[PDB]
Amino acid sequence: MVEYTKESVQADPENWRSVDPDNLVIFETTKGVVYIELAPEIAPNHVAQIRKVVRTGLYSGTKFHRVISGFMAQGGDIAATLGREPDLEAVDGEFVFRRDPKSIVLTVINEEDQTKSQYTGFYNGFPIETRQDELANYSEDKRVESWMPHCAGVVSMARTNDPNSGKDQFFLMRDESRFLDRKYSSWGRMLEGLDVAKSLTIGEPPERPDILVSAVMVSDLAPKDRPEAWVMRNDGPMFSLFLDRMGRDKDVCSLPQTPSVVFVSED
Ligand SMILES: [Mg+2]
Ligand SMILES: [Mg+2]
DSSP states (O other): OOOOOHHHHHTOTTTEEEOOGGGEEEEEEBTEEEEEEEOTTTOHHHHHHHHHHHHHTTTTTEEOOEEETTTEEEEOOHHHHHSSOOSOOOBOOOOOEEEOTTTSOOEESOOSOOOSSEEEEEETTEEEEEEOGGGGGTSTTSOEEEEOOOOTTEEEEOOOSSTTOBSSOEEEEOSOOGGGTTTSOEEEEEEEOHHHHTTSOOBSSOSSOOEEEEEEEGGGSOGGGOOEEEEEOTTSHHHHHHHHHHOTTSOTTTSOOOOEEEEOOOO
């Protein structure tokens, strides 16, 4: 809706947060590129797992083997294309995190007095849903339960009925899917490439699935080769204007994603 230049973003740290290259993953697919920001504060062990799997090279060539319109695109089944079970352990479910409301502060969408058991907002460009902050007054850890809801753009971990079976398979959220919330380990967000995810070939499985051609951690690239990503600061005034413009009656998943931009290197 609004295009932001690299110059305008770099000059304005009040409104733009630079993404850590070790939190930035490039998924090159047969429908285009997806840039994912990892969310270590939301799912620390899953974020470590994704870095680990990416760095094995084993995601390369994995299919998007389960793609459901209006839901998600699932990929990352290494065994299916490697031809053998990979040397890879499962990761325990991380469906919620314990948030300190004095430390990790959500930007609310509506400033009106809250009256529900839960609310949503943004932190570092990630959508967040939470139990009420007032519970932290008396909880044993002075924290409250929060999670990253499965809005379009979120990236999460596939699993079986076993909550600890997440390992390699992931899904790219194509549409708001709140029935997944608190049941699947969301761990990242597509800064760019939601449209790419929404274009992956549908099927269970597709006859001829799209492919995750390569995955790269940006921190593993030489400095001059690194794309540079920025995410609008939810607590800054440009985001206030964005909410004004888009509608503050909307829940976090009915808004667009937090404005984000990825700039690739010159030749
Ligand atoms: Mg769709
Ligand atoms: Mg409250």
